[PDB]
Paper text:
From a protein sample concentrated in the presence of ATP, we solved a 2.1 Å resolution crystal structure of Bp [name]. This structure had clear evidence but weak electron density for de­phospho-coenzyme A in the active site, indicating that dephospho-coenzyme A was only partially occupied. Coenzyme A metabolites are known to exist at significant concentrations in E. coli and thus it is not surprising to see dephospho-coenzyme A carried through the purification from the expression host. Refinement with the occupancy of dephospho-coenzyme A set to 0.5 (i.e. 50%) resulted in crystallographic B factors that were in line with those of the surrounding protein atoms (∼30 Å2). Dephospho-coenzyme A forms many packing interactions and hydrogen bonds with backbone amides in the active site, but also makes hydrogen bonds to the side chains of the conserved residues Thr9 (which is conserved as a threonine or serine), Arg87 (which is conserved as an arginine or lysine) and Glu98. One copy of Bp [name] was observed in the asymmetric unit, indicating that the other five copies that comprise the biologically active homohexamer are crystallo­graphically equivalent. The overall structure and ligand-binding interactions are quite similar to other bacterial [name] crystal structures.
[name] ([name]) catalyzes the fourth of five steps in the coenzyme A biosynthetic pathway, reversibly transferring an adenylyl group from ATP onto 4′-phosphopantetheine to yield dephospho-coenzyme A and pyrophosphate. Dephospho-coenzyme A synthesis by [name] is believed to be the rate-limiting step in CoA biosynthesis. In [name], the [name] gene encodes the 166-residue protein Bp [name], although it has not yet been shown that Bp [name] is essential for B. pseudomallei. The crystal structure of Bp [name] features a Rossmann fold, which is known to bind di­nucleotides as well as GTP and ATP.
Residue numbers in the entry:
A (entry chain A), B (entry chain A), C (entry chain A), D (entry chain A), E (entry chain A), F (entry chain A): 0 to 91, 95 to 161
The structure:
């Protein structure tokens, strides 16, 4: 059979933890669609278009990975992609179970499947990544060199 | 004896999960006062007056339920209502135990009693409800038809 | 109205934390029935009869508190006592939510209400109490003097 | 592609919660192998052979589900089945993350994927199921009629 | 040996819970540096300078306690103080483990050590403290009299 | 100043996670006493004497680490060692906070300090280690070669 899985997120920016999940999920499912949510309410540091370019630079080499943005409901993005799985990361839960439970009513034949990144990525926080970068600290332990470049450029252009 | 219980919350808007707690709590206590907190700091989607009308439309049929707003301290609302119980919902906790623990010093003879909604309401998040509704998605699985109407009207009037 | 609440537990032995919950719950409900579960599978340190005497010595002075044992299903003990509330303690949950959720199917009109003991009793563990007492350490910070006597006698009679 | 997933567990007995996970997982993966672990150390109420018959009676109608026992390491059962996924249930975690984390070292190309059962099965505990059944209470809300029969027979034969 | 420990935080304002940790940590380590983080992003109620004065008024009597502000990276504040320990409070964790885990990469020879305040301070929330004070409620159960004065003055000057 | 810290545990057997905590704690405190608890009630796989030899083989090279057994109360072992700190590991808590909270009453001037092992050891479970070893699986990812030898010998001698 052919199974498409969606991995949605704000990805502000894509971290080594997100990337590791992408590697892992994409070896299981036929197609893995990385869905970059507009996330207007969260006031993301990078624009949607920047977040797509960031993610594409890191992920473009995976042959069965598509990176796409969405501005609307996850329901509509999942159906559009003929997807029967939503992948989400769990690190060692409030939000995730609510989201999954509500998606059981909104997308009744879609399965949310929780995956866990490698040990070394378990403790990466996006908020802490952005904060460190905005204070001029390097986050190359947490994001790829291409992403660090984007962070440096945006912080410099902000100040 | 006569026991009045207060069930306070932002209720932005009242969900089927809140409503289920109201049903359950009001069959135990003589009077159940639903206290709608102004919650100015949270920047609620609906105004206090709208949140009261919303809640009254859903709850008015329960004979021992009162719906009232408050703009001040919970302590003052609880005393005003001669209440010896504060009801709060727990779903499967940081905030709730802090709030209860601090209320043990502020309201020493008042008992916080935690109740849990039916299975089907365990995963409803208010934040997700508002977000879905603001993106034009229906939330009738999570709120009553009267509440969906309010949501549709406010989203239309916002845009 | 008249509301009877059951507070069930193994109580091996009744701690200051259990006692504090009893005080608190019994000021709210008309009758509070402390239900001592036989708990055969847990292999309790004290026998059921000893656990009843222990609890009665501590609680007998509360006029609306009954202490009773049960060897069967909680369902049958709750119905017998015309109870519409089960009180359980929460300290800062796996077991408690499963138990409550399963009781929603077994006892559909009964409400489980979770209460939290005073600050100073939040960290008492029964297992640690028994272990300390079995090693000859005093647990008077955690159980009343009458209970310490029972513990000392049983540990001496064991060895 | 062809993806085999293993869903291992003690299954003492298979509950409606396990069954729901099986339904869900087996609509995603090509083959879903239910692995019944011997679990000698847990002293299971039913024997391995009984647990297999129990599970087969409930699951035999699913065309891509295999029910098999294993007495050895999960590693060996997973490899035997050419499986690249281990499915595990999460309800609203200590054990599960340890198990998954240790399996990342033991089975480096195998992905543990956590799934969550429908709302109505979120609160079923196996321990509580067995305890109720051993006290003569019906657990038909928690296990299928075929499983209730097995429970009744074993409890009667124990006493 | 000589061991300096840093206890960093927003301290908006210093509570009795923070103060208790300071007392406890400073009896173990030779020097305890209380690091007041600028925390611009959190939009703190008090300015950095106010938060330093607040903390100094309460803590100045401890002979081996230094109170200092920092506007940059924790890494730079920790190195500046020749510190090999970061002290953090735990009450009965998401943020704290991420922060500690990320600090293992940023400060590889520095140990994060988690301490827990006395029972009576376990449930104090800073957010609730500020909210109560902004509504005109007294928080003397949660902060020292000197801190209550600062809160009263700032709330009066805000309105 | 001179500060002795105790790190107590069952250590059945000492894992790479325990060892990492020992390394970390012993670079901070002047003396680190590893206290091997008899733990009779837990029915440990190795005897106390075996657990001491196991731990000494791994830890003997650390100059400020002492490995000692204790059969009585932790209180008595801590006082004997003039210790003002108890070190405990946290991985990403019920037991640990109860233990610490009860120790606040039993050892009022002693501080429990929680430390967290490196990323790669966060998911090691002792129970899973023993179970794997008893089924004939290698646990060299989780324990040092010297410990694997002990495990192999004991499993062979059991069967
Ligand atoms: C954006 C959505 C999907 C939420 O994703 P989120 O903002 O949490 O993405 P984020 O970039 O934070 O992370 C992406 C995923 O990886 C996980 N993750 C975070 N850090 C790590 C790490 N170090 N390792 C592994 N995984 C991680 C996150 O938990 C999440 O599962 C949600 O807002 C959404 O779908 N909204 C769209 C509109 C809608 O329909 N809303 C209703 C949702 S029910
Ligand atoms: C508004 C208060 C009470 C907090 O309530 P909150 O904003 O969390 O209300 P909310 O609408 O989110 O929910 C109401 C209650 O139902 C619970 N709940 C939420 N979702 C669900 C669900 N699906 N099912 C059942 N219960 C639920 C909430 O946990 C809460 O217990 C608090 O801010 C307050 O009392 N402030 C007033 C001023 C004051 O004195 N502050 C000090 C407080 S100690
Ligand atoms: C005995 C029952 C009720 C479980 O109770 P338990 O053994 O956990 O009792 P225990 O003595 O440990 O504690 C009693 C209550 O006080 C709570 N508690 C424990 N410590 C403290 C403390 N320091 N402060 C406050 N509360 C506390 C416990 O969480 C529990 O809520 C359960 O086994 C039962 O009801 N079985 C009877 C047969 C049956 O029908 N089984 C099905 C149950 S759904
Ligand atoms: C048996 C194993 C897999 C553990 O499974 P466990 O005993 O927890 O199975 P159990 O019957 O309890 O449940 C099966 C699965 O469904 C989950 N589950 C439990 N209740 C529910 C419910 N109501 N709804 C959904 N899922 C549920 C469980 O969490 C588990 O994921 C483990 O012991 C094992 O694999 N051992 C074999 C030897 C080995 O290699 N050991 C090392 C393991 S790393
Ligand atoms: C300010 C920092 C340290 C986070 O601290 P935080 O804002 O949580 O401080 P806060 O005042 O809330 O509390 C201080 C400490 O005491 C703890 N605490 C809170 N309440 C209590 C209580 N009642 N009892 C005991 N401890 C408590 C907090 O958990 C925290 O450990 C963090 O933002 C930081 O270090 N930033 C600086 C720049 C940087 O390098 N960022 C990267 C961090 S990895
Ligand atoms: C033995 C004691 C200390 C409890 O220790 P425990 O049995 O949990 O030890 P264990 O070997 O499991 O682990 C030792 C420590 O390292 C931690 N740890 C476990 N795994 C890991 C890991 N992978 N990485 C880091 N730390 C870990 C444990 O949480 C514990 O903190 C306790 O029983 C005790 O002190 N009893 C003695 C008598 C007494 O006075 N009892 C009262 C106690 S209040």
């Amino acid at each position: 059979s052919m199974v498409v899985a969606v991995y949605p997120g704000t990805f502000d920016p894509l971290t080594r933890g997100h990337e590791d999940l992408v590697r892992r999920a994409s070896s299981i499912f036929d197609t893995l669609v990385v869905g970059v949510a507009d996330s207007r309410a969260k006031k993301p540091f990078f624009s949607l278009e920047e977040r797509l370019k960031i993610a594409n630079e890191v992920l473009g080499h995976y042959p069965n990975v598509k990176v796409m943005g969405f501005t609307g409901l996850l329901k509509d993005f999942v159906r559009a992609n003929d997807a029967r799985v939503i992948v989400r990361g769990l690190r060692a839960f409030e939000y995730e179970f609510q989201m999954a439970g509500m998606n059981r009513y909104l997308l009744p034949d879609v399965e949310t499947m929780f995956m866990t990144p490698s040990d070394q990525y378990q403790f990466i926080s996006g908020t802490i990544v952005r904060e460190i970068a905005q204070l001029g600290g390097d986050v190359s332990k947490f994001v790829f060199p291409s992403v660090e470049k984007w962070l440096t450029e945006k912080v410099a252009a902000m100040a």
